[PDB]
Curated annotation (Swiss-Prot), chain A:
Gene: NOS1
Domain characteristics, as noted in the entry: The PDZ domain participates in protein-protein interaction, and is responsible for targeting nNos to synaptic membranes. Mediates interaction with VAC14.
Transmembrane region(s): none
Functional summary from the UniProt entry: Produces nitric oxide (NO) which is a messenger molecule with diverse functions throughout the body. In the brain and peripheral nervous system, NO displays many properties of a neurotransmitter. Probably has nitrosylase activity and mediates cysteine S-nitrosylation of cytoplasmic target proteins such SRR.
Full-sequence range covered: 302 to 722 of 1434
Protein family: Belongs to the NOS family.
Species, as recorded: Homo sapiens
Protein name: Nitric oxide synthase 1
Length: 413, 408
């Protein structure tokens, strides 16, 4: 690998130089003969595996606070090494945990929102022992992050993995999501994405209202025990009914969505340590709701219904009736959130901010890993600046990772 | 290993074995992906490449290891020995050109790959000859609006000092002019090429949509200017089926997209002039040509006529105007009976093509970054389709612009 890799923006002709890729730690899935850039996803660490991973991270941390090679750095190194040697693992200091979480976000190549990476409230939940305790921590997170509509990014970090048989897990994919119900006739009520999880909740004892927008209960696993069900207090769940500034009929569609996107099924990796329960939240880019949640054929799938209300010619694809309806739905989502003073960002503003962030990162850090396939929004790609921006994708640690769904691996007691 | 690609909407899983055939580099490594980067002979080099190609050709016609196949290899080897190169048979040229298209990972139009009219222009020696061949291509491909895919192939590279080149990036394009007030008139993408034409004696009309002359280089000589006969240049005035004011924008485009600056590589041989043409997908014109900030950049004017509120981005005024412009382009071509395909129909055909290719070929190299359309991405099926990208030969390649190489 050459020391300097250059990226060009084809619209501005700006050329940036990447050196940070030299710090890449993991595989992308690509090789010199194949690219897997559009592939969605292309037992514990031993003492000897853990040693260099910890040192790599501790070095990175002390370099970041301008104390590299200091007495405190050398002492922390020795202390960590001693701990790994005597206990097969180690515990992060609060400072290091905070640094690690912010950097996992900073390193998330798929995230367009990273200009915000240094403003992340970190909740240390490593003292948690029970599902009830996890419930308490999660409620506090939701309330803090929601902030009456003035959303604040946050992460709550539960105890790290030990032997792999005592994992903390949030079984939910996001803290707040809507149930989906498969009907005897093959139709689906609610969110089809969530049918499997909904069925699991029902089996565990959840009594479902069986509506279109039912907030799912939390299914929480502490210390490897069987997961337990909890209802999020509804006053903590901020929702926005969707209406359109021109179309008075849009409200009659009965759509709404929740304000807080809070992904809860990822794994946070810091210094070789694995935090299998680390729910984090930011705020929405409008297209996540207006394009994907509402218009994906396998999701709420509303294009036809909206197009019919718009009196559109739906006989030919070339009338672009779908595209026309898609825009109006996204206008409505943004309009409804702004009207209710719930933080949201449009895809133009978000990508423009991301470009500035990327330029700053190249300047101060020597690069910014970015996954074009994910960064470019799902509508109007080329009229956003990110479409024209060459990117380099690579994996830096600390990082957020995918992990298997817990019902697939859980040993029921 | 066999690699699986999944469609996340349909849950269809395909199995790729074809990638195992590639030997050319992608640009990525195990540690860095360059998937969004635009651009990541000798006798000794020549024979194995030739052999590789002759082998797959005789395999494709189910006569691998035949007397014909063996005689051909023997023939090619002697020819490389005694002349430092070799000449393709007509059958081989056609097979190779079709497969370069078939292997073009960035092309969403590949369901048409085996329907390609190949014009053999390897006997051409002068720019005048090049002009004749190109006029014939344009006339055949245009076909009064019923567009037909075609490629015209000029003599291959010999020593690199006698290249045939079409200096135009496409056979038909619009001039761009830098103005005193620092603005650009016409297509800003073509400002440089336009200046070269002017320098060489082209008298510019200095309008918004002036069809550029052809600038043609034969056998490494200085390029020469030619005017395409205007009756051969099919154009479409853009109007809108609802907005009667849209025609007042004075917009038009040409019907024939004919890319002329790529290099066609077959069996180690390099065809530096190989203009090829198909037909448009509407977004090429309506989104990129018309709405790129660096191109005609019409969103603001259009949004004005639509009386949209343009104070805040979150009104999505850009997205609204964008859809209407793309409706106009499709409507206009269709009303004039000029072949064009919308991004919905095109991507749908591409998914079917992928399925065909996995079934009969073991895979289909595809570049998601290029395949997904520049508007309404996730409401087309390719957005949800995992793709594998790898490099197969015969292929179309980029080459440097001739004005950065040519000594006059
Ligand atoms: C502050 C506002 C934020 C915005 C506007 C934002 C925006 C986005 C968007 C639009 C995506 C693509 C999601 C999809 O299409 O499914 C994404 C992905 C991602 N975000 Fe951000 N994000 C924000 C905050 C955060 C925070 C606070 C974290 C972690 C601390 C984070 C970590 C990630 C990760 C790891 C991904 C990749 C997800 C995956 O691969 O499934 N983001 N972000
Ligand atoms: C017949 C109808 C066709 C359609 C609708 C079509 C569609 C497209 C589109 C939309 C692109 C993206 C181009 C861009 O965004 O600049 C593309 C790329 C490409 N097409 Fe096709 N195409 C067609 C025929 C052909 C033919 C006949 C050939 C060659 C014989 C071809 C070879 C290529 C190549 C090499 C690329 C990649 C261009 C690059 O890398 O710059 N296509 N196609
Ligand atoms: C996991 C999966 C598999 C197949 N299809 C779709 C998915 C969903 C992708 C999950 N990632 C969603 C995600 C993650 C982090 C986010 C952070 C902020 C934000 N606004 N949205 C996010 C959205
Ligand atoms: C030339 C260039 C330089 C820098 N960045 C970007 C580019 C754009 C690449 C141009 N490719 C255009 C192209 C190629 C083949 C096509 C075939 C059919 C068709 N309808 N359009 C095509 C359009
Ligand atoms: C096949 C493809 O990789 C897949 O559909 C991806 C494309 N890009 C994406 N980009 C974002 N932001 N979110 C997604 O879910 C996806 N899905
Ligand atoms: C940076 C990025 O690679 C570049 O803008 C690409 C993105 N995808 C594209 N896709 C198509 N079809 N055509 C293009 O010119 C581009 N440009
Ligand atoms: Zn790659």
């Amino acid at each position: 690998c050459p020391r300097f890799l250059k990226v060009k923006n084809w619209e501005t002709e700006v050329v940036l130089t990447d050196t940070l890729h030299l710090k890449s730690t993991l595989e992308t899935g690509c090789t010199e003969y194949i690219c897997m850039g559009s592939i969605m996803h292309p037992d514990v660490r031993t003492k000897d595996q853990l040693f260099p991973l910890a040192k790599e991270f501790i070095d990175q941390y002390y370099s970041s606070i301008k104390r590299f090679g200091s007495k405190a750095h050398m002492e922390r190194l020795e202390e960590v090494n001693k701990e790994i040697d005597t206990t097969s693992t180690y515990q992060l200091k609060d400072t290091e945990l905070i640094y690690g979480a912010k950097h996992a976000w900073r390193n998330a190549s798929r995230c367009v929102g990273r200009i915000q990476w240094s403003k992340l409230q970190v909740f240390d939940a490593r003292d948690c022992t029970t599902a009830h305790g996890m419930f308490n921590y999660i409620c506090n997170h939701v309330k803090y992050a929601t902030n009456k509509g003035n959303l604040r990014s946050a992460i709550t970090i539960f105890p790290q993995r030990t032997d792999g048989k005592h994992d903390f897990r949030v079984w939910n994919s996001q803290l707040i999501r809507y149930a989906g119900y498969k009907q005897p006739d093959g139709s689906t009520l609610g969110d089809p994405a969530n049918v499997q999880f909904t069925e699991i909740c029902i089996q565990q004892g959840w009594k479902p209202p069986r509506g279109r927008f039912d907030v799912l209960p939390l299914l929480l696993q502490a210390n490897g025990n069987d997961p337990e069900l909890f209802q999020i207090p509804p006053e903590l769940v901020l929702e926005v009914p969707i209406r359109h500034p021109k179309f008075e009929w849009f409200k009659d569609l009965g759509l709404k969505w929740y304000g807080l996107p809070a992904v809860s099924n990822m794994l946070l990796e810091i210094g070789g340590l694995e935090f299998s329960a680390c729910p984090f939240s930011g705020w929405y880019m409008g297209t996540e709701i207006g394009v994907r949640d509402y218009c994906d054929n396998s999701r709420y799938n509303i294009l036809e219904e909206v197009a019919k209300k718009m009196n559109l010619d739906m006989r030919k694809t070339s009338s672009l009736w779908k595209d026309q309806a898609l825009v109006e739905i996204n206008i409505a989502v943004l309009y409804s959130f702004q009207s209710d003073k719930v933080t949201i960002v449009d895809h133009h503003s978000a990508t423009e901010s991301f470009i500035k962030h990327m330029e700053n990162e190249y300047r101060c850090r020597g690069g910014c890993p970015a996954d074009w396939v994910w960064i470019v929004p799902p509508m109007s790609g080329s009229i956003t600046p990110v479409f024209h921006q060459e990117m380099l994708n690579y994996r830096l640690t600390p990082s957020f990772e995918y992990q298997p769904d817990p019902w697939n691996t859980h040993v029921w007691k």
